[PDB]
Symmetry: D2
Subunit: 422 residues, 4 copies
């Protein structure tokens, strides 16, 4: 008794919010992938932070490494609501990751070593290593209980995924005790589970270390001159060889409004998945429940007026089907379908928006037809523009993925001669 309440209390979260999101390819070019707008008013890292609140871990480490100003500002404004006198705080740890090191060189692990003295000053018994550019719902206290029950030194959150995409994350092979037998990091030919050939038991980048080991284990890897200083390439394979690595099935701890559904864990890294995962919310029955009161997700909530709908220049009405319209939006006529409008979006008359993601402060000119697109923050689409109808034009002007999703950025439009400053 009195373990699940005294386990978060002794533990500290370390959100590795340094992802470059290179597969968004322009969207995160300007801001860290943890700061990517998602689903109304939220930011991706909020998820990884909210799970730490609702799981009782009120001591978090936000390790900002690349292009991190908006993440710093966002944390400062929204999550600067803790009294540090009662051991509950979001320590924003600038990583200052070595410039000598290239993109993902002096990797994930080298950023948690540079700030090791400050982590030691926390005197935690346990530590929660997290990837803070993912979307999921999880109670980390259930994972800490499952970590202490097994008497392990590292606990990896493992989930079965399709074997056609399992090369993107580390793949493990476990025994009856969920103890790791074999870890392999980004394999070209992922091994399947024994019971399921079409699936692979992949890691989720959610580790739980006992602190005194983690420290003892980082320095050995820090002195190493051959390692990539990466949690998947170097540390977890070593712990697997030692035999002190255990697995945690994510279905045990995922926070689901409805128990019947398949666990929800979206690795947003590619544009087409960002678009899909933003449009899941606009559907008739979303897979991710934002209206869950048992498990609320918090963000920086600014004072916006209600979403205003008005008549077009001709005086007619506007139609909306399966759409999200956040605060500050203004709409005039303009049939909307399957789309998601972030804050302060102005859509003038005669517009047809279908399956679009409009990031904050967009200005859509009159008579615009937008389809299967992602409009970056603070764009100004000119009058008469047409996107998504002719594929070759959209590839020629904007970034069009192989699937058909289009990404419209200020830069692209500036280059087209449509002046943006407004």
């Amino acid at each position: 008794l009195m373990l699940a309440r005294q386990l978060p209390l002794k533990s500290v979260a370390l959100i590795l919010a340094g992802g470059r999101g290179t597969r968004l390819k322009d969207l995160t070019n300007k801001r860290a992938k943890p700061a990517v707008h998602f689903g109304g008013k939220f930011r991706i890292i909020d998820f990884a932070l909210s799970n730490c609140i609702n799981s009782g871990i009120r001591r978090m480490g936000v390790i900002t490494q690349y292009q991190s100003h908006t993440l710093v500002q966002h944390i400062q404004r929204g999550w600067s609501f803790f009294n540090e006198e009662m051991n509950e705080f979001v320590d924003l740890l600038p990583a200052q990751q070595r410039m000598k090191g290239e993109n993902w060189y002096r990797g994930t692990a080298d950023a948690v070593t540079q700030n090791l003295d400050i982590i030691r000053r926390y005197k935690a018994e346990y530590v929660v290593i997290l990837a803070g550019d993912h979307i999921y719902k999880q109670d980390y206290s259930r994972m800490l209980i499952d970590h202490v029950e097994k008497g392990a030194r590292c606990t990896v959150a493992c989930m079965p995924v399709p074997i056609e995409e399992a090369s993107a994350f580390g793949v493990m092979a476990v025994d009856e005790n969920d103890k790791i037998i074999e870890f392999v990091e980004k394999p070209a030919n992922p091994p399947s589970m024994p019971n399921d050939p079409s699936k692979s038991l992949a890691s989720m980048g959610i580790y739980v270390f006992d602190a005194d080991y983690l420290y003892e284990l980082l320095e050995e890897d820090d002195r190493d001159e051959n390692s990539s200083h990466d949690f998947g390439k170097d540390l977890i394979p070593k712990i697997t060889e030692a035999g002190l690595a255990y697995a945690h099935p994510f279905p045990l701890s995922c926070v689901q409004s409805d128990p019947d559904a398949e666990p929800y864990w979206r690795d947003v890294g590619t544009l087409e998945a960002y678009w899909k995962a933003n449009l899941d919310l606009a559907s008739v029955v979303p897979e991710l429940d934002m209206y869950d009161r048992n498990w609320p997700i918090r963000t920086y909530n600014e004072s916006l007026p209600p979403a205003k709908f008005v008549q077009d220049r001709s005086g007619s009405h506007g139609m909306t089907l399966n759409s999200l319209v956040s605060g500050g939006c203004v709409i005039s006529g303009s049939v909307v379908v399957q789309s998601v409008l972030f804050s302060r979006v102005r859509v003038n008359s005669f517009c047809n928006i279908d399956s679009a993601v409009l990031l904050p402060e967009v200005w859509v000119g009159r008579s615009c037809r937008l389809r299967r697109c992602v409009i970056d923050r603070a764009c100004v689409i000119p009058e008469g523009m047409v996107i998504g109808e002719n594929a070759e034009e959209d590839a020629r002007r904007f970034y069009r993925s192989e699937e058909g999703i289009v990404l419209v950025t200020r830069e692209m439009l500036r280059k087209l001669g449509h002046k943006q400053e407004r």
Copy 2:
């Protein structure tokens, strides 16, 4: 030089947020009129507070007297964002107005006397007496500059209003210097201005006193056994007899996005004006600009998901014309017109909502037709209900004003047998 910056610094605001709003007649029965929801996510007193922020008066006194729990909670959550170490705070002063005293007996003024020692502890040179159940935009620093320039002891904000409603507020007659010649409080036959017969120069319940006089002036009225201890009936007529009362034309200080319009000051006290003033925002060109960045109005902003629009049970779309939909709302089909939806309103399919004000957390059942109505907070309208089409039915069930506006409350619906707890 350096007067307008050093004038708010020496002054403290006193918001008289004890209004009963008796002319709403059920709406404020449960909460103080300053806590009445207005226009999306705001509360009326926020206006009187925001004007104090944007006018530099960061020391406010919120004198809560009647049925004041939601106002206390609202202040505690939203406006508890000040560091008192730098002389900037919202002192929530429980008035504890004498029970012996009846409704508006031991009036406006007796509530600012009971807490006089604490007001003296502020050591202010000036004090701003405000009515905190009104809607307006005003820069009080311009009023303090105009107060010091004239060398007065009390400065009353005066505005011309129609003489057919001027009996509701105190009426003054001023000279060329804006110095008060004759004050009269709630006259049955309001005297007209000399230049305009159809108008009367009425007070707005916005006074500015030099503190050392105000104190000296309250005690004399406090020792008095004949007075009503009311700022309009007792104090300001006395100052008018002394000749130390001056007037401030509200057009000089009103904060207007567009200078061409007539000043905006709504005395919400009656239901029909609450409805109109809430529906002005949904119109094509509102008279009150909420999107003004120079003069933002702040409220308690809670984290709500975006306004979700979905398909009805039949799969068809939903139409919105000249409407406001705040955060957390959910709509399925349901043609909406000229209405305003507060937070967390759920409107099921086949509904026709026209010129309605739906306060937070309403649940409208399927196939509801609502017209020219005001639905009180946390109602649950049953399936098939029809309001606003047949006047006699709406008078028989709910409160129907003489104009045609309908007010739907939990109590009324509970009495009809429609069980509300959900």
Copy 3:
């Protein structure tokens, strides 16, 4: 597993901060006993609030009933640091206890009934009834675990106390299962424990109810016309007759830095105990540990400069032995012993302060000798005053208890002709 973490989450604290502290007899005459300054920078209710934080109960109800302005202001400034979007808040519930009712008439319980609808809106499974004018350290989660393990409907925190003072609190007789056999409220002849004749097993005013019962149980007592609507006189005796009342030995849950000591629970209600409990902190080995990092006690922490020590008018030094000097204090010479100085105390030269409690903003004139006294907040002791040396003089001027403790208030000194406004 996962009970102690999911038990506070479903529970809400109700701090009954309406105590009049009549046995302080002037100290709480001006402010609610929960707002009584204690031990440096803290307020008594902070203890009852901090225990709710460190025990995970982040939903608190502060039921303010009498003379409650400083408590409201204190909560608003200090404990208004919660985001209510994640179910964690201090709901300041004005009780508005019936005036018809006299001092402790329509008692403890009638104040938790008037606000019952709002408590129901919390949808808690459990509720923690607390006395918020006491000093103690306790982990309420251990008490909730012990409450669920026994399968009870009310859990009372019981502690053995001396039988010479056991008439002050309710006395219970329990079985081997800690199930209540016999409850009796403020008996003139308290029954002793069977094993110890010199002690009585008394209640601590810390109850834990399962919510759905509590509601069901308040209304029955609310409809009652014969009850005192008191938790000790009416409700807990009834639950004892039903047989659904269980006891919780406070030694199991008390948070002690050193396990060897006897539990620390001070019922401050009398002046002499307020003085002793404030001087325990100044001793060489305090019984209550404020430097405990595992269990921090939070208060409204204002920005004060360090405690300044300077030379007297003659240039000599100042001596301090077993003393506490909080922020903002200023001392010149002035031998100090066994005393406790609250914020912004100025002690001029040639003063001898021995075993004194100086509340905030005191001004001690030159050549003052103070001994075994309690100086109320914002006093101004004149030059040459002598307290504590001649008992009859101190009884004649100030309030001198039977033990010898002296209480100096502004009123008393105003009456002596020593003008205080400074």
Copy 4:
């Protein structure tokens, strides 16, 4: 009228908190000079921030460049108390100053260019360039009024200083209109004022630019390949050649409790001045008034218990003369003189501390004699250590300045074999 209130509103502060403080030589080796502890509980940058609050400039830019984690954390905890919805915020701008650039290469100015787009997003009419590693009290609104009255494009705060140290700051020669005639940056032979030979009219690193010029002026210097991108070397000399530079005598705007004193502006950069400026506060009549209520200086105020004084191991008392003891300190006996104790300092028995600055969390062992020293944060001085009595020993072990001041750091003591981790 209504200029001094509408001038801060249109202006934004830019605190250049990237100083390396190389002349402290170990003290700032670990933390940015703006984060250097000063005078009880404050940090140097707090001054530059507090002046912006009390001068109405509630929009600040904290440009963190070097070794900036504690400054980020300090801002996040203390100064994250603003609602950004009402245009009032501390935007923490990571500078990410070019590594290619050496210490003070791509200087002061290049750090305000890299973040130019975000500064433009503020749409300020004026901008306040500040050095955030200095100590002073100033009302910037008086400076903005004096800036608009003269019709200038840059306003430099100028003060006469002694000509024996005037080579450390830029030296100007002005006309009767306070218009700059000749600027020269760090001259080896500073020119004296015409009326005073012993003084030079030096700059204070406090500039006020009209924004649209500043932008226009940075890019020209940014395109330049020959400049040092320094505000003193490059920009202000260019503006002086244009003739659009004006001077602001700092005595007009300094905030002084007593008008008779000489303005207080301490350039802390050297250790001996840090020690003196920290010991000015402990004196009998400090030159800098921290008890000023008109102009409060705010810091991150954590909940600390009062400064505890107790008896030594032998039971004797402790003497304090002209000393500051902040919260959390603990003292046993231990004669103290002319010193300043930061938070959580523990001084065991038999210690003689004279004219010392003990930074937070120091642990002084028994029988220590400390004189004319500066003990760095979180040291642990062993038993019997003697500092300041024999100069050669202190030079051999610790850093001893030419004047006699000693600086004790963890590193130094670690190297001596006194293990520090506690």
